[PDB]
Design an enzyme around this catalytic site. Structure first.
Site, PDB file in Angstrom:
ATOM      1  N   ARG A  66      33.337 -44.298  -9.423  1.00 35.39           N
ATOM      2  CA  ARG A  66      34.147 -44.319 -10.682  1.00 35.39           C
ATOM      3  C   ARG A  66      34.392 -45.734 -11.170  1.00 35.39           C
ATOM      4  NH1 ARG A  66      33.240 -39.883  -9.469  1.00 35.39           N
ATOM      5  NH2 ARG A  66      34.736 -38.238  -8.723  1.00 35.39           N
ATOM      6  N   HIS A  99      34.520 -42.823  -3.661  1.00 34.13           N
ATOM      7  CA  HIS A  99      35.016 -41.888  -2.607  1.00 34.13           C
ATOM      8  C   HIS A  99      34.016 -42.015  -1.415  1.00 34.13           C
ATOM      9  CE1 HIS A  99      38.109 -39.838  -4.778  1.00 34.13           C
ATOM     10  NE2 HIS A  99      37.302 -39.495  -5.759  1.00 34.13           N
ATOM     11  N   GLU A 108      40.528 -43.313 -14.434  1.00 38.45           N
ATOM     12  CA  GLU A 108      39.222 -43.267 -13.702  1.00 38.45           C
ATOM     13  C   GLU A 108      38.240 -42.422 -14.496  1.00 38.45           C
ATOM     14  OE1 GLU A 108      38.509 -40.613 -10.251  1.00 38.45           O
ATOM     15  OE2 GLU A 108      40.504 -40.112 -10.172  1.00 38.45           O
ATOM     16  N   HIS A 167      40.907 -39.432 -16.396  1.00 45.96           N
ATOM     17  CA  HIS A 167      42.316 -39.016 -16.128  1.00 45.96           C
ATOM     18  C   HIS A 167      42.941 -40.176 -15.421  1.00 45.96           C
ATOM     19  CE1 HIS A 167      40.476 -36.739 -12.576  1.00 45.96           C
ATOM     20  NE2 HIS A 167      41.036 -37.774 -11.999  1.00 45.96           N
ATOM     21  N   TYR A 185      37.821 -35.437 -16.776  1.00 44.19           N
ATOM     22  CA  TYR A 185      37.762 -36.908 -16.830  1.00 44.19           C
ATOM     23  C   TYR A 185      37.635 -37.405 -18.275  1.00 44.19           C
ATOM     24  CZ  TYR A 185      36.702 -36.854 -11.897  1.00 44.19           C
ATOM     25  OH  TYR A 185      36.830 -36.762 -10.492  1.00 44.19           O
ATOM     26  N   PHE A 188      39.950 -43.680  -1.776  1.00 39.44           N
ATOM     27  CA  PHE A 188      38.821 -44.524  -2.310  1.00 39.44           C
ATOM     28  C   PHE A 188      38.703 -45.823  -1.549  1.00 39.44           C
ATOM     29  CE2 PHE A 188      40.270 -42.445  -6.394  1.00 39.44           C
ATOM     30  CZ  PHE A 188      39.054 -42.174  -6.962  1.00 39.44           C
TER      31      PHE A 188
END
Ligand SMILES: [Ca+2]
Length: 104
Positions: A77, A92, A58, A40, A38, A100
């Site tokens: 996120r 999530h 994110e 990404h 991350y 999501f």
């Protein structure tokens, strides 16, 4: 009160500005952290109505308030774009697989 609620995690606008700054600096440095690398790219297949344009990225926001530095990213996120504009806060939690839902 929570500015954003993801599942049962509560975040203030300060929490989101702190996570976004950290994630955007790694994007400018061409660096990532964590086993899942991350920040990404984020693809908006769920069609959330973001008012800022893509590309989107994110980056994890941690319930503890710490900035992510590796280890488990949790399920929440911040999504920001190429111009460092916040697009939204998603999670999530409450969605199947890698999908999501938006934090409220
Ligand atoms: Ca906090």
């Amino acid at each position: 009160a929570c500015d954003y609620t993801c599942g049962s995690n509560c975040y203030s606008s300060s929490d989101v500005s702190t996570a976004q700054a950290a994630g955007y600096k790694l994007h400018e440095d061409g660096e990532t952290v964590g086993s899942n690398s991350y920040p990404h790219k984020y693809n908006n297949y769920e069609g959330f109505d973001f008012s800022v344009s893509s590309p989107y990225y994110e980056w994890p926001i941690l319930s503890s308030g710490d900035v992510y530095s590796g280890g488990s990213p949790g399920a929440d996120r911040v999504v920001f774009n190429e111009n460092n504009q916040l697009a939204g806060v998603i999670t999530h939690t409450g969605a199947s697989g890698n999908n999501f839902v938006e934090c409220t």
